[PDB]
Amino acid sequence: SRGEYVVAKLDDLVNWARRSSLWPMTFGLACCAVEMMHMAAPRYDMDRFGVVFRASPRQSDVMIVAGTLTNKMAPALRKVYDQMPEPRYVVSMGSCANGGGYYHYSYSVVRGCDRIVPVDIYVPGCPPTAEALLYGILQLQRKIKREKRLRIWYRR
Amino acid sequence: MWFEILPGIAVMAACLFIPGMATAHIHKFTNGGKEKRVAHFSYQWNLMERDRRISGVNRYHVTKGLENID
Amino acid sequence: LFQAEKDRRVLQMLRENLEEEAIIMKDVPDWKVGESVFHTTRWVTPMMGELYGLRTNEEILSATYGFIWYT
Amino acid sequence: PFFDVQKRLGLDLDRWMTIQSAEQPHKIPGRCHAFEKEWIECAHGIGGIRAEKECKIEFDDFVECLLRQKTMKRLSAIKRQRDKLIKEGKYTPPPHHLGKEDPRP
Amino acid sequence: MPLVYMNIIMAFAIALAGLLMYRSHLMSSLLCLEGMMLSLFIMSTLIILNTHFTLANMMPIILLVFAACEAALGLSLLVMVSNTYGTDYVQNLNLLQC
Amino acid sequence: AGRIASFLKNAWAKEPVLVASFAIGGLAIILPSLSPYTNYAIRINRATPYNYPVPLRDDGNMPDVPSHPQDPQGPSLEWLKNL
Amino acid sequence: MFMINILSLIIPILLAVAFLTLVERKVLGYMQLRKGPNVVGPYGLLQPIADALKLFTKEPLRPATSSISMFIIAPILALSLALTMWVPLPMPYPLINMNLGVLFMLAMSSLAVYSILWSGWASNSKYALIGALRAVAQTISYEVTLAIILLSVLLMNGSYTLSTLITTQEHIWMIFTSWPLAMMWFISTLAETNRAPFDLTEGESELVSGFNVEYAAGPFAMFFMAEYANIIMMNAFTAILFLGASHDPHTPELYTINFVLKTLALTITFLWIRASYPRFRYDQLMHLLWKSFLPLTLALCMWHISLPIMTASIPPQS
Amino acid sequence: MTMYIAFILSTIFVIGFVGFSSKPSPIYGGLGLIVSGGVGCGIVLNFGGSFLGLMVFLIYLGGMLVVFGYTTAMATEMYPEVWVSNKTVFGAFVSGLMMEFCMVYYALKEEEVEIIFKFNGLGDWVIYDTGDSGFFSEEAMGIAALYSYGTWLVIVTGWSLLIGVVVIMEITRGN
Amino acid sequence: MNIMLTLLTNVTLASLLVLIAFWLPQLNAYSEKTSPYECGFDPMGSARLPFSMKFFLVAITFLLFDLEIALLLPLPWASQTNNLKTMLTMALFLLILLAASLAYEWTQKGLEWAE
Numbered sequence A: 001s002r003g004e005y006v007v008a009k010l011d012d013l014v015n016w017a018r019r020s021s022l023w024p025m026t027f028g029l030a031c032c033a034v035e036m037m038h039m040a041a042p043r044y045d046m047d048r049f050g051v052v053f054r055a056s057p058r059q060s061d062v063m064i065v066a067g068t069l070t071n072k073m074a075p076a077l078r079k080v081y082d083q084m085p086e087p088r089y090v091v092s093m094g095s096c097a098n099g100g101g102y103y104h105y106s107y108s109v110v111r112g113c114d115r116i117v118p119v120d121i122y123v124p125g126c127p128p129t130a131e132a133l134l135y136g137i138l139q140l141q142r143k144i145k146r147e148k149r150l151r152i153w154y155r156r
Numbered sequence B: 001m002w003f004e005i006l007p008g009i010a011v012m013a014a015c016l017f018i019p020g021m022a023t024a025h026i027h028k029f030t031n032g033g034k035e036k037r038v039a040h041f042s043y044q045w046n047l048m049e050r051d052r053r054i055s056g057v058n059r060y061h062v063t064k065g066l067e068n069i070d
Numbered sequence C: 001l002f003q004a005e006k007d008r009r010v011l012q013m014l015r016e017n018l019e020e021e022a023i024i025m026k027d028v029p030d031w032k033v034g035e036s037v038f039h040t041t042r043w044v045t046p047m048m049g050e051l052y053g054l055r056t057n058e059e060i061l062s063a064t065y066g067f068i069w070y071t
Numbered sequence D: 001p002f003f004d005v006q007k008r009l010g011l012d013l014d015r016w017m018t019i020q021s022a023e024q025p026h027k028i029p030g031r032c033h034a035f036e037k038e039w040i041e042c043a044h045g046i047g048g049i050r051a052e053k054e055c056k057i058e059f060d061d062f063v064e065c066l067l068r069q070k071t072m073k074r075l076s077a078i079k080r081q082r083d084k085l086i087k088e089g090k091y092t093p094p095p096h097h098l099g100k101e102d103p104r105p
Numbered sequence E: 001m002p003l004v005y006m007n008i009i010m011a012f013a014i015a016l017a018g019l020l021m022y023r024s025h026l027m028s029s030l031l032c033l034e035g036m037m038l039s040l041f042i043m044s045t046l047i048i049l050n051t052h053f054t055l056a057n058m059m060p061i062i063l064l065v066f067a068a069c070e071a072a073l074g075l076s077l078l079v080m081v082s083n084t085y086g087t088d089y090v091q092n093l094n095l096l097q098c
Numbered sequence F: 001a002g003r004i005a006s007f008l009k010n011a012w013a014k015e016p017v018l019v020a021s022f023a024i025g026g027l028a029i030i031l032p033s034l035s036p037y038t039n040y041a042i043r044i045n046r047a048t049p050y051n052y053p054v055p056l057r058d059d060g061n062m063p064d065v066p067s068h069p070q071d072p073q074g075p076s077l078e079w080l081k082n083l
Numbered sequence G: 001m002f003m004i005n006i007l008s009l010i011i012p013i014l015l016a017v018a019f020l021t022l023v024e025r026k027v028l029g030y031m032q033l034r035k036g037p038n039v040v041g042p043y044g045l046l047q048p049i050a051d052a053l054k055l056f057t058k059e060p061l062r063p064a065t066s067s068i069s070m071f072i073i074a075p076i077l078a079l080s081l082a083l084t085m086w087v088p089l090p091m092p093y094p095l096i097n098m099n100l101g102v103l104f105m106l107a108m109s110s111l112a113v114y115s116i117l118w119s120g121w122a123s124n125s126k127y128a129l130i131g132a133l134r135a136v137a138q139t140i141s142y143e144v145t146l147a148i149i150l151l152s153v154l155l156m157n158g159s160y161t162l163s164t165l166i167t168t169q170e171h172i173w174m175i176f177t178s179w180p181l182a183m184m185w186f187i188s189t190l191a192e193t194n195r196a197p198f199d200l201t202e203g204e205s206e207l208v209s210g211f212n213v214e215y216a217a218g219p220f221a222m223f224f225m226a227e228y229a230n231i232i233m234m235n236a237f238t239a240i241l242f243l244g245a246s247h248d249p250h251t252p253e254l255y256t257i258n259f260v261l262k263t264l265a266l267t268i269t270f271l272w273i274r275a276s277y278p279r280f281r282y283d284q285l286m287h288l289l290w291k292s293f294l295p296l297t298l299a300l301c302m303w304h305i306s307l308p309i310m311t312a313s314i315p316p317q318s
Numbered sequence H: 001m002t003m004y005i006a007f008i009l010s011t012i013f014v015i016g017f018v019g020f021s022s023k024p025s026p027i028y029g030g031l032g033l034i035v036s037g038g039v040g041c042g043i044v045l046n047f048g049g050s051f052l053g054l055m056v057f058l059i060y061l062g063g064m065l066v067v068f069g070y071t072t073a074m075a076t077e078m079y080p081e082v083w084v085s086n087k088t089v090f091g092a093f094v095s096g097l098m099m100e101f102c103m104v105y106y107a108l109k110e111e112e113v114e115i116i117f118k119f120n121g122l123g124d125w126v127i128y129d130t131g132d133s134g135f136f137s138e139e140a141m142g143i144a145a146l147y148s149y150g151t152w153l154v155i156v157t158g159w160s161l162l163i164g165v166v167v168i169m170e171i172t173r174g175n
Numbered sequence I: 001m002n003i004m005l006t007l008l009t010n011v012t013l014a015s016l017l018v019l020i021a022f023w024l025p026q027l028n029a030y031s032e033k034t035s036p037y038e039c040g041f042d043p044m045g046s047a048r049l050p051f052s053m054k055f056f057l058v059a060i061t062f063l064l065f066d067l068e069i070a071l072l073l074p075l076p077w078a079s080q081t082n083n084l085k086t087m088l089t090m091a092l093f094l095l096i097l098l099a100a101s102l103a104y105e106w107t108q109k110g111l112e113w114a115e
Ligand SMILES: CCCCCCCCCCCCCCCCC[C@@H](O)O[C@H](CO[C@H](O)CCCCCCCCCCCCCCC)COP(=O)(O)OCC[N+](C)(C)C
Pocket: A009, A010, A012, A013, A016, G041, G049
């Protein structure tokens, strides 16, 4: 049908815009953030992929959890994530954010950020290299390229 | 590259060319091709009104030369 | 030259206004055609409401706001 | 109260602005220059009490030049009579009052 | 008088009535005073332009000047009042009676 | 000569902007009175014909008034054409 | 036919803003030993389109605490004033020919400030409030000096009309007559457009995002377009004021090209300026404008009042 | 009454006056005064006073910005009031709007005197002058004559401004 | 007429842009999302509480100086008078008083912010 073709093209166009212009919130916790700083460094230059740090949660598309989430910090992390306008995506960076990591058996550590927020991409490492984080970012872009919102609305 | 900034600057220049050039072209087209008259003071406006009245077509830009003296 | 043409144009428009004012005012009981509002008998410059009053709105705008609105 | 130091010293601190018939820049006249000139010359030295009564004609002309109330009333009468004649269809305004006048320089 | 003159005059009357009534804030009454100056400026400008009084074209400008000082004056008083009470409420100006 | 010089040197060392501002202001105040071209400026301002020159009615004894614009009488702007 | 002219003035300016985003990103990249956007499209040419599409397809949030009416009004006012800035500019023929163009543009800028003021106040955020007060301070710092600078430079033009500036500079540039003013004027524009080193109302190093911290998606996009359009317009105004190109009444294309080149040069000058130095404290900017720029501006105003009288060189227009 | 432009602008002028005359939160009052200043600039421009309108608009915009700065500091009003958030503010706003409407209706349909005198209408275009001359602006020359004719005005105005600066310094001293 | 059309078109374009911004994307508002932002943790007080301004005196001075610029605005026209000496004297006198006001407030520590 022509409607199917139209919604397919519109979904592609919409997906392309979202994938291309990804704005992660300027937010780091621990060790891994330093590696994130190296992804914005001249060698890798995430800005050339359309990726721009933005301080305000509202003007942010991605939240990169780069570091250990503690029990004292979890409410703050949840709050900023909530204040991101949709669509929003979460990338878990490093062992500490993935599953607690080297502080897994600690009284003051949340064992993985996925108990607080839903996670899209899990980047392993301690810390993941700037190439590892960049690979995870491109994987998230490929995942966004794969999603279909207008097709589901049309079939439903 | 450093010359890869040039395509964006060229697109900027192409975009910024359009306002002034289009304004000049529209001014020529609407006023008969002769640089739309400027009336900063009332005397110039009176001149324009006289031209419009004597044009016989209600357009100020239509100019009557020596061929109206018989 | 412009002064002479302005004088003739104003006088002509006043004369047409007077002739029509006579035409409309047939049977108004105590109406004097062409009566002034000034005690003095000297010339008084027309109000421009006296000139384009009985005329179409387009040239009323042209006479009033024509210069101000022209840019 | 009023200490006329300007008249005593011949200074003209603020008398240049009191009337519109007094030496405007570039000789630009007021819209009712003649009427105010006549009214001022009528009542120059006779005094306020005599001026308010003996120079009332010039003052009335000046005020009706300023506000044009009588002219507005006359024009409104003309307009309403023309409108009532038109509404019942007996006037037929001429072409030159409808925008069809042969223009002149 | 045209309708424009009556509109400006009634705007001045509205601003004066707004000043003469105080709700709680001194800043609102200062705004009403400045509105009265604005209405006076507009009215005098229309009167001068209509009658072609050339030399009077400068008096509205002077008018604006003596608005600002007055406005400035008011603002100064306000901060002092605030410094005494922490609020610009006219209720606190009640130490002196009739 | 020995006190104001030291004061000016210190002011130039510390506040060059104020020294420049006061110098420019003093020059702008003083030089216009000491200039021969101010009268020329006033004459140029007077020579601009903003409004119509209304002719005077001939009574018979006005030798300094011209009868035609190109007559030798009347003001001349040849001082302006070479200025 | 006037609507066609309005659209021809509006749409190309928006496109030029969209691509000035790319130009600034690439200039900063190459000045910081990197490349900048070069992936989305050839040489990054499609990056602005992607950014706009992403921004206008993302949801907009209305804060519960914030007043909604003024919150919505502020970006509309900012963008509309940014677009209205361009109508009196002669290129070489203005869209609207005004007898008082400088005054109109100056007044319009004052109106534009309120949108920032109302964005900060209406957001009801402590961070939002701080940026708005910095905007108040900045405007208080810069307007007076900017106004006297315009008056002093226009004393040699004879009138406030912008089309007379081309005739004034038919033989020489105005910057050869008033270079000490131009410098200050340049700095004043940097303060008027909230640009580095005076990016204080939206200071990201202290205020996270400044006045528009609570804004997202479309309203934020409109604020961003208003910012960049104001940048380009002020640089065009500087070019017309101080760098007077020659005009051929039979060939206005040459004037348009030369003016556009000068405007682009000044815009690249702002981009070069932002990367080079750190942000000013908002009290240091006020002290710089009042204790340094104001005395020189007053002295130069006196000098430029006196000079035509001293040299018998008063401009024509009454 | 052609295009009703002057009348519409005057009506908006009075509406903005009523809005800030209802004594609501100062932020709203400044907004209304800005609106009234802009429409007053338009009214003055329609009569040929371009410089005065632009001048009045410019002064008020600068003045209001200062008023906003002061309101944020000293009239903050934790729950700021809008024209529909309070009983008395809405009452005053509605009363002003209805007085505007009734006076307009009576003066337009009828010819009634309010305080001074009555009116007829027919638009504000009638009072014009059809003056046809000049390579200059009469308003511009009238304003520029301040430095040649109004020397006394310049003296008193400059003295007043300097004294005003001294007055502000002395008043805000405290101690 | 042309300027009013220009303003109307600009305002209409901005309003259409904001309408597209608010009606095109999918919206899922909830209480947590709309809460005021303050670095994750909930703000202590409110935005409405008084905000001390340390440059109030400079603000009043700007109010007074703003008026002075209006007086200086008509100077270009005033330069065309036949009484050039009087106009120059008055313009210089006005600028000298403006500079004297600035100097007086500077020396009286009026340009320094409150602590
Ligand atoms: C006129 C309408 C105006 C409003 C709408 C906007 C109009 C213009 C919008 C822009 C049109 C083109 C945008 C997309 C251009 C394609 C770019 C291309 O690179 O995308 C590829 C293909 O894109 C998708 O197949 C489809 C995207 C576009 C959808 C079709 C176009 C629909 C709009 C056509 C214009 C008219 C629209 C009318 C709407 C009313 C996928 O690339 P990607 O794999 O990521 O790149 C990876 C980089 N690597 C290689 C290094 C890894």
